[PDB]
């Protein structure tokens, strides 16, 4: 089993959340070149940004397996554990607990060698005043 | 025997007239935080 | 998931969007040619 039922998207065996979690050193030993780094600003009480719709177009069937871009989600694990139920069926996906404002975490995932860095926020809707926007 | 943050406001005006006063106060109070230490703290939010 | 089927493998065939560069490769001669239409026609005729 490599693709989905329609054979139009990539697929993988259900991976446990604890397997894909990487620490700063663990991300340091592995080589992340030409990958995608997604920065998530959210917590347990935030709203769900549908990260599935972010990863589905990237790993389609028209791309080769070696051509797939390793997607690393740098953000709080408290929010990310609520979204792993829709992401575990995708390959080459890793999660790094931390904050996007920490330069150590950014250096861990080799932020300098990435094709694109995505910065997203989830708790912005809850806040109302323009200053905190 | 008492200390309040309300006595530190007078720093700002002084800091405008000469930043050397603030630099001396910092290097005398915090224990000598060199700018290299400041950069290292700003990098990893810890001490190595 | 799904198993290997010729229908799925046929479904795999699509057009992917990407971004090529004019510095080196077969289009380097047209990098400063000043005819974007000629480059488009050549790319469509040769590599579709």
Q: Using CB atoms, which chains have 3+ pairs under 8 A with A?
A: B, C
Experimental method: cryo-EM
Identify the bridge partners of residue A96 per DSSP, sorted by sequence position: A74
Q: Which chain A residues have a beta carbon less than 8 Å from that of B44?
A: 102-104
A116 to chain C, any CB pair closer than 8 A? The answer is no
A89 and A14 in contact (C-beta within 8 Å)? Answer: yes
A82 and A118 in contact (C-beta within 8 Å)? Answer: no
Block residue for tokens 């347990």: A44
Residue burial A18-32, b: 16+ Cβ < 10 Å; e: rest: eebbbebeebeeeeb
A42 and A49 in contact (C-beta within 8 Å)? Answer: yes
Block residue for tokens 């990893």: B44
């Amino acid at each position: 089993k490599k693709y989905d039922s329609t054979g139009m998207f990539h697929w993988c065996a259900p991976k446990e959340i604890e397997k894909v979690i990487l620490t700063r050193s663990e991300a340091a030993m592995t080589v992340l070149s030409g990958h995608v780094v997604v920065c998530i600003f959210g917590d347990v009480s935030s709203a769900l940004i549908g990260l599935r719709n972010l990863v589905m177009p990237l790993r389609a069937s028209n791309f080769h397996y070696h051509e797939l871009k390793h997607i690393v989600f740098v953000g709080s694990i408290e929010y990310l554990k609520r979204e792993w139920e829709t992401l575990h069926n995708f390959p080459k996906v890793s999660i790094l607990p931390g904050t996007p404002l920490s330069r150590a975490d950014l250096r861990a995932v080799n932020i300098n060698l990435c094709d694109m860095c995505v910065i997203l926020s989830a708790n912005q809707n809850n806040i109302d005043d323009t200053s905190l926007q | 025997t008492a200390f309040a943050v309300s006595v530190l406001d007078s720093l700002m005006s002084a800091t405008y007239f000469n930043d050397n006063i603030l630099t001396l106060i910092r290097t005398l109070v915090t224990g000598g935080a060199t700018p290299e230490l400041e950069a290292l703290i700003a990098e990893e939010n810890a001490l190595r | 998931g799904g198993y290997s089927t010729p229908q799925t493998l046929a479904n795999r065939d699509r057009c992917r969007v990407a971004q090529l560069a004019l510095l080196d490769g077969p289009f380097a001669d047209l990098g400063d040619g000043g005819c974007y239409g000629d480059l488009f026609c050549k790319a469509l005729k040769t590599y579709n």
